[PDB]
Design a protein around this ligand. Structure first.
Ligand code: HEM
Ligand SMILES: *[C@@H]1O[C@H](CO)[C@@H](O[C@@H]2O[C@H](CO)[C@@H](O[C@H]3O[C@H](CO)[C@@H](O)[C@H](O)[C@@H]3O)[C@H](O)[C@H]2NC(C)=O)[C@H](O)[C@H]1NC(C)=O
Ligand SMILES: *[C@@H]1O[C@H](CO)[C@@H](O[C@@H]2O[C@H](CO)[C@@H](O[C@H]3O[C@H](CO)[C@@H](O)[C@H](O)[C@@H]3O)[C@H](O)[C@H]2NC(C)=O)[C@H](O)[C@H]1NC(C)=O
Ligand SMILES: *[C@@H]1O[C@H](CO)[C@@H](O[C@@H]2O[C@H](CO)[C@@H](O)[C@H](O)[C@H]2NC(C)=O)[C@H](O)[C@H]1NC(C)=O
Ligand SMILES: *[C@@H]1O[C@H](CO)[C@@H](O[C@@H]2O[C@H](CO)[C@@H](O)[C@H](O)[C@H]2NC(C)=O)[C@H](O)[C@H]1NC(C)=O
Ligand code: CA
Length: 595
């Protein structure tokens, strides 16, 4: 199908071969093929890339070249006609807490990250894209349609820059264009520790051999830690409030501060590392800094994998869980662990679960103050609300007691995301996540909706009547048809999310397939999977099976009432219990004797 060795821009290192620990870059997991699943490599292609020029140019780039005979509708128009809604009332998920959403984003950020192309600082093309909206090279603007209110207010377009790609980065000329995954393909808490040796090192506290992660020195949260501020200026987080002047946090992953709840979750994970690191130190005084670091890191990785596969995915894939992720039979070296390019859009299903407001709660889970409930859009890259206004506990209670947004064919993505998204590079709260997503599909050269329906062994609708049957919706199907002319052209993002949900799940037949396969692969292909014999000991495994996100809260915050099942919708005080009633992680099977 292709060539074989275009394996350039990569920090190439040598494998320790016998190390009990994962590498930070992801290298050396697979023994026959070291770089398989590594970071800064191209995303895997489950299907051949579909470009306008069958190489690099996206569909919609040249205005005269059609896709399958039709012109691809503008991202933002697909957004304005299908993805929008005004009535937030009734849109909540009756059986999923806010956390259900927040975890998806954690999982995702561990697995995949496609950075925009750089070659730009002290540059006029950043301005040639912003001001004039001139399509060229890596500037691929999202134009506003006729009758779009952002025309009167914002301009002619929203800047959008194509994602980075394999061997070079500037122009180029050779084979097809493959995007970069800047993070490791394994569910390994890479969002906590980093995916590069340098970042991973900056994040560490090497002033002490306690194996702790660097914490903030300027601010504390009731004797608890915050993440370290970010060195780099200009800082997006200082921008949103030039009086407060509070930088973004420095975590393992660069999107950390993208929104308060995300930063909250990160903070909880950093805290859990140091907790384990000093609890392990108490059990094993003789261990050195490196040992505490790696052993705690390993436990956090185990922790993440368990919650995801035991608590999170069965309530996403519902009944289709068994069909795609059968019980673990052991490591399989023939499996491709790599994250596929299409997965990075399939997982964007979590976007339709984000609600319009974020709440804080006092100790009685009662509203925290006069402005307890805030609009989502005022929280992107907002750290000053955490540091200068109450800590993470009121936000964490919100995550538990409040609900997620239920995907709804009539009410897909909230306006807080569709109209008022803040981009770290720019100055306005006026971007469209929906347009970006749709534009990015095309940027990445994703095959059509029917290409993926076929890939998954599902019927491929050609007609309006066909589409109505598969989507079980006359109106929706009709709008899609009028925009796309042909079901073969529907972008996978909007197409996959448009299908009704599977029994006891929160995605459709096509999404449950794409997700299902991927998650099956990263597990079966990961040598350091927690259940893989030899990774942990039987007693160690026996201890990890008792972990629960609820406990994580209890041990890392000052909350005392939590639910047992934190992903389902829970009512205070009926479903909440005292932390004393919640099973602990017994770290005793991690004891090591001399003689
Ligand atoms: C603000 C944003 C969120 C919350 C308010 C949010 C949330 C999620 C959830 C809950 C996801 C899955 C369960 C999820 C997946 C992926 N996202 Fe998304 N997200 C917010 C904002 C963004 C922005 C901005 C982007 C960048 C889009 C671009 O193409 O430039 C974004 C991306 C993604 C993504 C692709 C990751 C990658 O490979 O680069 C997901 C799989 N999110 N988000
Ligand atoms: C609201 O969502 C709840 C969480 O999914 C759900 O409770 C769950 O019900 C399912 C069956 O629908 C059960 O699933 C589990 O059953 C046994 C328990 O003996 C486990 O061994 C299996 O692994 C399986 O996962 C659970 O009994 C239950 N799960 C939890 C965590 O409580 C409610 O039914 C939902 N409410 C409604 C009415 O929709
Ligand atoms: C930028 O961030 C500022 C702080 O990070 C924030 O100002 C703060 O917000 C409120 C007022 O809006 C004050 O909170 C309360 O202060 C005392 C009690 O402590 C009361 O008398 C007040 O009525 C009020 O409830 C903070 O003290 C205040 N801090 C300071 C020094 O400014 C701004 O609101 C943010 N600005 C923007 C543009 O969002
Ligand atoms: C690195 O770790 C050291 C040692 O654990 C930290 O030093 C402590 O800092 C706290 C808070 O300021 C205080 O209790 C003491 O001043 C220090 N204790 C000891 C034993 O030295 C230090 O804060 C960490 N540094 C970073 C960058 O996070
Ligand atoms: C490990 O996974 C591989 C790849 O998914 C499995 O390989 C399959 O082997 C069967 C024969 O039983 C072939 O029909 C398929 O063509 C292979 N899959 C593909 C698409 O490559 C393998 O079965 C797994 N290892 C075991 C024995 O459990
Ligand atoms: Ca990872």
């Amino acid at each position: 199908s292709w060539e074989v060795g275009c394996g350039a821009p990569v920090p190439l290192v040598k494998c320790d071969e016998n190390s009990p620990y994962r590498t930070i870059t992801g290298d050396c997991n697979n023994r026959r093929s070291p770089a398989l699943g590594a970071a800064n490599r191209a995303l895997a292609r489950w299907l051949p890339a579909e470009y306008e020029d069958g190489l690099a140019l996206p569909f919609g780039w040249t205005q005269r070249k059609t896709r399958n005979g039709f012109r691809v509708p503008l991202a933002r128009e697909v957004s304005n006609k299908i993805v929008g809604y005004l009535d937030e009332e009734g849109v909540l998920d009756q059986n999923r807490s806010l956390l259900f959403m927040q975890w998806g984003q954690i999982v995702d950020h561990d697995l995949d990250f496609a950075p925009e192309t750089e070659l730009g600082s002290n540059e006029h093309s950043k301005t040639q894209c912003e001001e004039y909206c001139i399509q060229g090279d890596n500037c691929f603007p999202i134009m506003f349609p006729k009758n779009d209110p952002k025309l009167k207010t914002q301009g002619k377009c929203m800047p959008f820059f194509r994602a980075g790609f394999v061997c070079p980065t500037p122009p180029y000329q050779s084979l097809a264009r493959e995007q970069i995954n800047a993070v490791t393909s394994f569910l390994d808490a890479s969002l906590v520790y980093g995916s590069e040796p340098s970042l991973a090192s900056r994040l560490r506290n090497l002033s002490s051999p306690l194996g702790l992660m660097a914490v903030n020195q300027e601010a504390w949260d009731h004797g608890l830690a915050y993440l370290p501020f970010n060195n780099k200026k200009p800082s997006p987080c200082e921008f949103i409030n030039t009086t407060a002047r509070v930088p973004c946090f420095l975590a393992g992953d660069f999107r950390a501060s993208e929104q308060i709840l995300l930063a909250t979750a990160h903070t909880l994970l950093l805290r859990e590392h140091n907790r384990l690191a000093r609890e392990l130190k108490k059990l094993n005084p003789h261990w050195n800094g490196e040992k505490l670091y790696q052993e705690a890191r390993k436990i956090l990785g185990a922790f993440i994998q368990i919650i995801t596969f035991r608590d999170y995915l069965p309530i996403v894939l519902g009944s289709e869980m068994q069909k795609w992720i059968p019980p673990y039979q052991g490591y399989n070296n023939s499996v491709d662990p790599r994250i596929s390019n299409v997965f990075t859009f399939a997982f964007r299903f979590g976007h339709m679960e984000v609600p319009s407001t974020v709440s804080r709660l006092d100790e009685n889970y009662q509203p925290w103050g006069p402005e307890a409930e805030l609009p989502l859009h005022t929280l992107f890259f907002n750290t000053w609300r955490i540091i200068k206004d109450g800590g993470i506990d009121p936000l964490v209670r919100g995550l538990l007691a409040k609900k997620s947004k239920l995907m709804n064919q009539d009410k897909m993505v909230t306006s807080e995301l569709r109209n008022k998204l803040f981009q770290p590079t720019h100055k306005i709260h006026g971007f469209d996540l929906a347009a970006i997503n749709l534009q990015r599909c095309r940027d990445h050269g994703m095959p059509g909706y029917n290409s993926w329906r076929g890939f998954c062994g599902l019927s491929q609708p050609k007609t309006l009547k066909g589409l109505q049957t598969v989507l079980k919706n006359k109106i929706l199907a009709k709008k899609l048809m009028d925009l796309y002319k042909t079901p073969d052209n529907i972008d996978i993002w909007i197409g996959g999310n448009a299908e009704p949900m599977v029994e006891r799940g929160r995605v459709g037949p096509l999404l449950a397939c794409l997700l299902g396969r991927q998650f099956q692969q990263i597990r079966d292909g990961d040598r350091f999977w927690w259940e893989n014999p030899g990774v942990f000991t039987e007693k160690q495994r026996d201890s990890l099976q008792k972990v629960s996100f609820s406990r994580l809260i209890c041990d890392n915050t000052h909350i005392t009432k939590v639910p047992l099942h934190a992903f389902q919708a829970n009512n205070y005080p009926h479903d909440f219990v005292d932390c004393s009633t919640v099973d602990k992680l017994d770290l005793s099977p991690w004891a090591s004797r001399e003689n």
